[PDB]
From Swiss-Prot:
Organism, as annotated: Homo sapiens (Human)
Outcome when changing K37M: In sporadic cancers; somatic mutation
Full protein stretch here: 96 to 292 of 393
Outcome reported for the amino acid change (mutating P128S): In a sporadic cancer; somatic mutation
Result when mutating T189A: In sporadic cancers; somatic mutation
Protein name per its UniProtKB record: Cellular tumor antigen p53
Effect of A66T: In sporadic cancers; somatic mutation
Effect ascribed to mutating R86G: In sporadic cancers; somatic mutation
Phenotype for L162P: In sporadic cancers; somatic mutation
Impact after mutating G92N: In a sporadic cancer; somatic mutation; requires 2 nucleotide substitutions
Effect recorded for C40S: In sporadic cancers; somatic mutation
Gene behind the chain: TP53
UniProt effect for mutating S90I: In sporadic cancers; somatic mutation
């Protein structure tokens, strides 16, 4: 089956936010609102903001999962390629097969779904630090979009779900991801292609 990607703010007004990092050749992570697409380098920090209009209950969690965007591939599990799953870059918590990691959160849990075999990473939802307006999760993507035997140039989406302590849905948002060597140039190219279209 295919997990839902429907945007759903839910009772708490849940949605994502992204920094404005620009498109310089040196940028390591940059988000395109026009494409709803994050462009990032391999294994580099991707800050994703969480916003709500009202306070959710203790025990609320935030899960991230990748799926293929194209209909002809959506049923295939997104995983790291045959090289990267074996390169011993473990952080001590993430299974080596998982594309998406959370950086710097010892409460992150990694799920291999016993029925769908899909991978996800989930953390407790936390209020913003004192003086901040939102909460940020730092994600890493551990293969290139181009990796042969893995994503193999197929576009993916990341689905972020706000969940209760049982795993029931409270909110959902999503964004496309390209993991690439030059996110700034690729964002500029894809935005210009969109404008020409
Ligand atoms: C989703 C992260 N986030 C926010 C993000 C933005 C804002 C608005 N600021 C102007 C408030 C919150 C917030 C309030 C409570 C909790 C919370 C309580 C228990 C667990 O999580 C989590 C929260
Ligand atoms: Zn790879």
């Amino acid at each position: 089956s295919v997990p839902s990607q429907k945007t759903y703010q839910g009772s708490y007004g849940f949605r994502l936010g992204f920094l404005h990092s620009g498109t310089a050749k040196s940028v390591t992570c940059t988000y395109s609102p026009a494409l709803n697409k994050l462009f990032c380098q391999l294994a580099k920090t991707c800050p994703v903001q969480l916003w709500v209009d009202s306070t959710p209950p203790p025990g609320t969690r935030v899960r991230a999962m990748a799926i293929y965007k194209q209909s002809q591939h959506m049923t295939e599990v997104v995983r790291r390629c045959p090289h990267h799953e074996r390169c011993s870059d473990s952080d001590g918590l993430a299974p080596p097969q998982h594309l998406i990691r959370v950086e710097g959160n010892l409460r992150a849990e990694y799920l291999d779904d016993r029925n769908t075999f899909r991978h996800s990473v989930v953390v407790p939802c936390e209020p913003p630090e004192v003086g901040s307006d939102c909460t940020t999760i730092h994600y890493n993507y551990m293969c290139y979009s181009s990796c042969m035997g893995g994503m193999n140039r197929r576009p993916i989406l990341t689905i972020i779900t706000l969940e209760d302590s049982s795993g029931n849905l409270l909110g959902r948002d999503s964004f496309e991801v390209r993991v690439c060597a030059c996110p700034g140039r690729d964002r500029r190219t894809e935005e210009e292609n969109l404008r020409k279209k």
